Every structure is written in C-alpha cells, then in structure tokens.
Design a protein around this ligand. Structure first.
Ligand SMILES: Nc1ncnc2c1ncn2[C@@H]1O[C@H](COP(=O)(O)OP(=O)(O)OP(=O)(O)O)[C@@H](O)[C@H]1O
Ligand SMILES: [Ca+2]
Ligand SMILES: [Ca+2]
Ligand SMILES: [Ca+2]
Ligand SMILES: [Ca+2]
Length: 901
DNA sequence: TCGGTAAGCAGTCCGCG
DNA sequence: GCGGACTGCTTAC
C-alpha cells in the first residue's frame, strides 16, 4: 500500500513519527528533519521559489529545527519577514506524504476507554488522584475486544469477581443486560492490588498503544486521573509510558474565567468523544452526561443503580463493572451512528494535519492552503499580530409580525464559499480598491459600475480575473465533497419518506428487508417490492434509511462548517491570511445579494400579478427569502385543488419554472454588474408551506427576526408523508426551555398551523389544568453557569446576580458542608426552578447540575416549595402570548353575543 | 467553555413626575 | 408597568 502517517511530534530537533508502512504494519522512526524557511531576495537572482504575490524568495535550509526557530526570532529582531511553514511537523508531513493520502482505518488503533474511581469525600480530582483506580475498560478496535481491569482489593472494600454469566442475564433476572453482541468480546482481568492492575495496564498499553484515543471526558478525567495516579504510586518516568515517545506535557487550557489542566501525550491523538460531539453534532443539549446523550442518540434506557455511586462498588460490584463496560460500548454505538471518528480521519488526512487538529479550522486551513501552495513552489507568508476589530455581517430583514398562510422559501447554495468563488477573493488576488457608493445604490442598480477590469464586492475591494486564488481553488474542492454527501443524505431522506407511506398499508406475512443502498433513490422495482412487506421489515428498512441519512448529514454538514469557517477565519487575527478587506468583501456582497434579489422577486411577482409595489418577500435572513404565495394560490382558486398535495405540486412547478428562472436572470445581471469571475449565486426553492386544504390552520407565522414557524409539506425536494413543523428561534428550539414545555408549545404551534384557533384553545386549557402533575425535571429551565464566583458574596448573591446564579448560590447553602453531595461545576449546565417565598431556602430560586436528580435530603423541600404558577407564566404562557398576538389568535376563548340562553 | 456576525429574550437595576 | 442600558445566554444564519 501507499504509506500513511498515524501521529507526528516535534521533540527537540527530532520529528517522531508513527506510521503504517507499505506492508500494512505499524512502525516508529525518529528523524533529524532539516526544515526550510524563506527570505525575500532581489529579482536578479537564480531561484524558483516565489511568495504568493510573485516576489522571489531564497530557501534557507537549516541544520535543525531549533536553528530555524532562532532564525525566525533573529528576523523579527531585525524587522524582516520570515516566510514559510513555521510548524515544522506540518512541513514534515508535506515532504514525507507528497500525494493524496489513502488510509485504511482497519490498521489504525482506535482505543476508547473509561475508568472508575471510588471516593468517599466527593469528586475525585484528577490532579490530586489520591484514590484508587478500581476499574478500567479499554476497547481496542484492532482486536475488537473489551479489556476489563477490575480491582478486587481496595481500602474502600474487598469484592468478589464479576460474573460474565450474571452480566448477560436480563435486568429482570437480576443481571445487568450487557448486550449479547459484545459478551464474547470481553476479556476479563481481576487483580489483587492496584499496583499490579496498573503495571499490567501499562504493559498492555505498550503492546497496544492507541493512535486515536477517545471516550467520554477522557481528556478532562480519565487521562489525567490515570497519569497522576500512576505518577503518585510509581513516579513520573512510569506515568510517561502512556506516551510512546515517553514525553508528556502538563499543558494549561485558558478561557475568559479560569484555567483547567490537561495532559498532552506525545505520539497519541486524543479525540475525547464529548468534544467531537459538541463540535460535530450541531445540537445544544441540556446535559452532556453519557446517560443523557445515549438516551437522545440511541433511545437506550439510562443505567439504573440504587445508592450513590460512591457506594456502588461496595453494594453491587457486579453492576459496577458491568456499567463500566456498557459505558464504553455506548460511545461506540454513538460513533457507529454519528461517525465522527471517520470524519476526523477523513478531515485530518485530507489537510495532512495531526488528527486532533480537526477541532481547529484555522489549523486545518493553514495546512490545506500550505500544501496547495508548496506544490506550485510558492511560499506562505509569516503570521503577523493584529488587534481584534469588529466588522459587519449579514443582513436580516425586519418582518411584519403576522400569520402567513402560503409560503415558498428560497435559499442560496453555500453562500459565503460561492461568493469567494464568484468574486475570486483570496489574499493574493487583491487587485485594488474603487470608490464605494452607499450599499443601497448597488441594491437598486443606480451606482456607478465599480470596474471594467476587475471583479468587485460592494465594500470597495477589486480582484484579478485571470486566475483562481488559492482560497477559491481549495474551498471548491471541499465544497464538491460536501455536495456529493449532501446528495446521499437527501436521497436517504426521500427513501425514508417512501418507507413511511408504505407503513400505512403493511402486508401480512413474514419476510426480510431488501439489501439496498439507501444513498440512492429507490428504483421502481424496489418501490413495488416495498409495497409488499411486513410492518416489521419496513421498520427495519426505515431505521437503516435513517442511519444512512444521519451518516450523510455528519459528512455534509461538517464539510459545510469547514468551508464556512474559512470565510470566518479571514476575520480571525490568528489566521495566517487574516484580512478584514476580504472578510467584509464577503459579508457585504452577501447583504447586497439578498436585498438585490428581494427587489427582483418583488418586481417579478408584481408583474405576474399585475400589481405595483406590493411586497411578496416577507422575510429574509443572510441568504434566504420567504415569499408569500397567497396571491398565486388565489389566482387559480382554493376550490380547484383536489387535495393538499395538488397545490404543493402546483407551487413546486411554479417555483421551479417561473421563479427560479427569474432569480437566475436577476443574479446573472448582478454578476455582470460587479464584473465577477464566475456566476455562482444559485438560489433554489427550499420550502413550500401551508395549512391542510379545507382546514382552519394558519400555515405559518413570524413574531420577529429569527423567530418563525411554518407547516412544511416539501423541503428541498423531499415530499413529506406527514407535514413537518419548521420552527426557527422559538422556545421549542432552545435548550434552556423545559422539556415538557418545549413539547406543549410545539403542540400549540401544530394546532395553530394545522387545525386553527379552536383547537389551540382546546389544548391550552388542558395543559394549564394538568401541568402541576408533570415531573419537576421535565419543567425545570436549563442554563450555562458562568462566573459563579464573581457573584458569590459570603454565600449570598452580589450585584446584578443573574437568576440562574442566584439559584446555584441557594443550592450551595442548602448542601453546606456535604463532602458527598454534588457540587455545581463552573462552565457546565444547571436545572433551574423557581421557589414560592417564603420558603426554607430563603430565595426565589434553586439550581442543580443538569442531567441529574437533585440530592435526596432537599428534593422533598424543593418538590414542596416549587412555584408552578411562576414557572408556567415565564416558560409557557408568555412565549405562547407572543406567538398568538403575532398570529392574530387568542389562546383563551373570548366572549361573544351568542349566550347564555 | 481551546480549538465569523446578527439578533432574539430573561433578568438586574433603575428611571419615569 | 415597561423601556433602556446592560449582562448572560442561546439561537439563526
Ligand atoms: N455555522 C456557521 N459558521 C460560520 N458561518 C456560517 C455558519 N452558518 C452559516 N454561516 C454563514 O451564513 C451563510 C448562509 O448559511 P446557510 O445556513 O444558508 O448555509 P450555506 O452556507 O448557504 O449552505 P446551504 O444553504 O447550502 O446548506 C453561510 O454560507 C455562511
Ligand atoms: Ca462511569
Ligand atoms: Ca444557504
Ligand atoms: Ca403493502
Ligand atoms: Ca439559509
């Protein structure tokens, strides 16, 4: 095979590399890499190296990396630019792997582990590491085995061995329901003492050294606890054996309010799954416990134990260890579904970076742009210091709050990257400036044509049209990857909807699901075959369709993120190619494009409808427009559509055959006006929305900017079997909103949009009546808890103390002097509940860590003093009042002249 | 929470005769 | 009461 890297480090004057050699085997080598940097030189000189602007450079080959680093200092000490890749291991991979890397994942050791540590005096701090490690479970992806390290003798209790037989039995037999499909993959190793447990673990680790290391909170807990514990018992040299090069750095992570501590293991790439999740999932959750995320992702039951976790190993060692194993499996199931390790490997080997650098868009694009320039013998600039300046963003239209009944939305494809491509925006493509007119003069096509030579943005910047810049060239490659996986996703979704329709009439037989590729639209034959399946086979197909869709969503949405980060990074002072001229050229172009096409759509529709100056575009945000289509439905007449699906088909065909052409002509003209390099403003129909035909539903409504709901029948070509609510910005979309209230508000919206006023009023009444019976956790608010210290005055709230922090302070006083009860952690999330005064907590609210029950000695007093009335008015009624004044409806039935006789 | 802007709403404080 | 200035948070793009 072609060789590929696994991990790379700089250590002193050596690069340390682990790699897969051409025979498929893992190897390590130390290289005395001799780096190269570049200095500008006079035109009259014999060279083949040029900086990105075409000025010649001379290569300076150094005896070692430290020399190169000292040269860089000396060049600043003089006041001259030191060009070229100053991260010497990126330089090493570009030289060592001068081709597109094909990797074989089956040869990369992905390890995912978790540990257990028993602790009578509260949360066991990884830097203290003063309590025994009594369980480790370590899954190895090359062996496909779960290795279980179990301490039977501790100062906190001696125990019997874990039983693999009791572990397999149902929880109803008294077992632990460890899933059948991993039972035969468990290699169980019990130990007499913690010393030997750790020595075997490190001996194991050295035979199977992880390349990728993941888990849940491995970076903030498991890894530092193991390192420090081994350090405390055996000394530092022994702990360092967690690194294959025997070097580790105790690095400090800063933020705006504090400094946590993590351990860097050289020659290993830590991708802690909690962070992979936060970056790539595109969710915001009320809690990031494993229990909680597992339930959300896999619908598996939470792992139940009685007593506190500090007594678990003592009360029920059997379950202790079983739950440790399942925890490890649960991350593997989440990854099987979401596929974030795959994505990370893909992204890492494409950029040619340390795999763990996928969390850094700046680092990823620095390496992509560098290798692209290097292959043309071009030399990247030095990074410079910049003060952080604010700059302008997108345009968002102010909507008239209202119900809106028939809506078609349109949206530009991958806007910021298409603008970059269309305009040719890149550091070295900058041709000059022209004298700007006010933006509206460009929107309304009255301003002077900015150039007849260069390609322009309405911020004043001009750009070369002869050749593509490195930024458009590289952004296009990744755009086309994104576009490919987006097709697999939409096809999987469309096929999803075909399986749902068929579930309405499932055949009575026994059979199995077809072996098909859900990434492609089902053929006529598969559609006939599906019509003859059992409900059980159809449901398995659906699950599979829905797993395929998720897989594509992961791979498409995060390529979208990566290319959109490039546009963003042009406005980050730590990016090598930072330039507000370019950042603002992108955003200002986007503002113009939205309002330009809004004007053209309105002109078009006023011409098709015979009117003058009537607004059809009701809203827009950044790159999208929503268009009222009432006047369009009305011109054929509500009464001539056979059913809902007939007017949707009508609007669809109108959107595709009348409006899309008109939009393209409108954008074609704007490209010509700005004299751009390539027309790439492709605005397709996104959503077609309305109430069910012959219903009293209102279809949709806007309350303000970034706050609306629509009843959608079709979305980017996916025709729903049942209409789908597209709710943006409203409280049903916020993680802060109690789960029970999110659900109730949604149903109220469903009834507004599909069924109308009377139904809304039916539901509201019942919710109000019954809501005192809801679980307290389903009706708590949630919030991030920052700077708890800033507002802590002797245990009482200081000035401007936010509500949720008052709740945390109340909590702290209530659990005073309990080493055992849960503390709220700075930076993490809490549940919040109002208290009726005058209660025994002495304040109007209480908060506790999200994802948990509140400790038992206060749960009764909280449940008893909970202020359900305040709670219903803040979270449910107030938002609902918002929606209904917007939609022109009443949530309570108002008196009329029709009673009482 | 280590790794772009625009803009909503909850809440504090405090004016508004 | 509710608006404005402000902080905190969380969403849409
Ligand atoms: N998460 C983000 N980070 C940075 N910029 C973003 C992000 N989301 C959107 N933008 C900016 O707003 C523009 C419009 O966003 P939108 O959500 O319509 O996606 P898009 O890039 O147009 O891709 P598509 O519409 O094809 O999914 C983007 O091109 C850019
Ligand atoms: Ca655990
Ligand atoms: Ca878009
Ligand atoms: Ca059937
Ligand atoms: Ca959009």
């Amino acid at each position: 095979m072609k060789e590929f890297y696994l991990t790379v480090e700089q250590i002193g004057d050596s690069i340390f590399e682990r790699y897969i050699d051409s025979n498929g085997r893992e190897r390590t080598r130390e290289v005395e890499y001799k780096p190269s940097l570049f200095a500008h030189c006079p035109e009259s000189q014999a060279t083949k190296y040029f900086d990105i602007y075409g000025k010649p450079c001379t290569r300076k080959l150094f005896a070692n990396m430290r020399d190169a680093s000292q040269w860089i200092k000396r060049m600043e000490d003089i006041g001259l630019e030191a060009l070229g890749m100053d991260d010497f291991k990126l330089a090493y991979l570009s030289d060592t792997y001068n081709y597109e890397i094909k990797y074989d994942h089956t040869k990369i050791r992905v390890a995912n582990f978790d540990i257990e540590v028993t602790s009578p005096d509260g949360f066991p701090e990884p830097s203290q590491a003063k309590h025994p490690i009594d369980a480790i479970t370590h899954y190895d992806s090359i062996d496909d085995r779960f290795y279980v390290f179990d301490l039977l003798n501790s100062p906190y209790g001696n125990v019997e061995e874990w039983s693999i037989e009791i572990a397999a039995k149902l929880q109803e037999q008294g077992g632990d329901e460890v899933p059948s499909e991993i039972i035969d993959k468990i290699i169980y190793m019990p130990f007499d003492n913690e010393k030997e447990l750790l020595m075997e673990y490190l001996n194991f680790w050295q035979q199977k050294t992880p390349v990728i290391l993941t888990g849940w909170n491995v970076e903030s807990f498991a890894i530092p606890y193991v390192y420090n514990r081994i350090k405390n018992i055996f000394g530092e040299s022994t702990a360092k054996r967690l690194s294959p090069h025997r070097k580790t750095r105790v690095k400090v992570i800063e933020n705006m309010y504090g400094s946590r501590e993590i351990i860097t293991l050289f020659g290993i790439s830590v991708l802690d799954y909690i962070d992979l999740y936060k970056k790539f999932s595109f969710t915001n959750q009320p809690s990031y416990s494993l229990d909680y995320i597992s339930e959300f992702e896999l619908n598996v039951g939470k792992l139940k134990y009685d007593g506190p976790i500090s007594k678990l190993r003592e009360s029920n060692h059997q379950r202790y260890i079983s739950y440790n194993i399942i925890a490890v499996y649960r991350v593997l199931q989440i990854d099987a579904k979401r596929q974030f390790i795959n994505l990370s490997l893909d992204m890492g080997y494409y950029a040619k970076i340390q795999i763990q650098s996928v969390f850094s868009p700046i680092k990823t694009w620095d390496a992509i742009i560098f290798n692209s320039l290097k292959e043309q013998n071009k030399v990247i600039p030095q990074g410079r210091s910049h003060p952080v300046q604010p700059y302008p963003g997108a345009f968002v239209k102010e909507p008239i709050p209202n119900r809106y009944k028939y809506v078609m939305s349109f949206d530009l494809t991958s806007l910021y990257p298409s603008i970059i491509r269309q305009v040719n925006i890149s550091p070295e493509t900058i041709a000059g400036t022209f004298k700007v007119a006010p933006l509206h003069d460009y929107i309304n096509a009255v301003a002077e044509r900015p150039s007849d030579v260069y390609s322009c943005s309405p911020n004043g910047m001009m750009y070369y049209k002869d050749r593509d810049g490195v930024v458009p060239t590289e952004i296009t490659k990744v755009f086309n990857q994104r576009k490919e996986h987006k097709g697999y996703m939409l096809a999987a979704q469309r096929n999803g909807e075909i399986i749902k329709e068929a579930l309405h009439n499932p055949n009575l037989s026994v059979d199995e699901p077809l072996d098909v590729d859900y990434r492609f639209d089902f053929s006529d034959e598969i559609k006939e075959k599906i019509k003859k399946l059992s409900a059980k086979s159809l449901n398995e197909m659906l699950f599979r369709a829905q797993r395929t869709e998720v897989a594509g969503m992961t791979a498409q949405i995060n390529r979208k993120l990566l290319i959109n980060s490039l546009a963003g990074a042009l406005g980050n002072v730590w990016f090598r190619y930072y330039d507000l001229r370019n950042a603002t050229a992108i955003t200002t172009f986007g503002q113009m494009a939205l309002q330009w096409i809004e004007r053209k759509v309105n002109e078009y529709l006023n011409e098709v409808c015979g009117t003058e100056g009537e607004a059809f575009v009701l809203y827009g945000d950044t790159d999208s427009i929503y268009v009222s289509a009432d006047k369009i439905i009305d011109k054929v007449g509500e009464s001539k559509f056979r059913d809902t699906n007939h007017w949707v088909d009508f609007l669809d065909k109108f959107a595709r055959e009348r409006m899309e052409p008109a939009i393209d002509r409108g954008f074609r003209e704007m490209c010509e006006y700005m004299n751009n390099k390539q027309h790439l403003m492709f605005m397709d129909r996104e959503a077609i929305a309305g109430p069910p035909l012959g219903s009293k539903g209102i279809g949709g409504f806007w309350t303000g900017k970034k706050r609306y709901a629509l009843n959608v029948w079709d979305m980017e070509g996916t025709r729903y079997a049942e209409p789908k609510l597209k709710i943006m910005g409203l409280e049903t979309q916020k993680s802060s909103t109690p789960k029970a209230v999110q659900k109730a508000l949604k149903e109220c919206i469903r009834r507004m949009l599909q069924e109308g006023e009377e139904s809304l009023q039916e539901y509201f009444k019942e919710f109000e009546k019954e809501f005192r019976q809801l679980n307290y956790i389903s009706i708590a608010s949630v919030s991030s808890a920052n700077n708890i210290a800033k507002y802590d005055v002797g245990g009482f709230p200081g000035p401007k103390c936010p509500f949720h922090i008052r709740g945390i302070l109340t909590y702290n006083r209530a659990i005073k002097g309990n080493i055992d009860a849960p503390q709220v952690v700075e930076g993490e999330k809490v549940y919040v509940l109002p208290l009726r005064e005058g209660n025994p907590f002495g304040d109007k609210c209480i908060a506790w860590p999200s994802g948990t029950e509140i400790t038992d000695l206060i749960k009764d007093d909280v449940l008893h003093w909970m202020d359900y009335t305040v709670l219903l008015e803040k979270t449910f009624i107030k938002p609902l009042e918002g929606f209904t004044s917007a939609a022109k409806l009443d949530y309570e039935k108002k008196a009329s002249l029709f009673d009482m006789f």
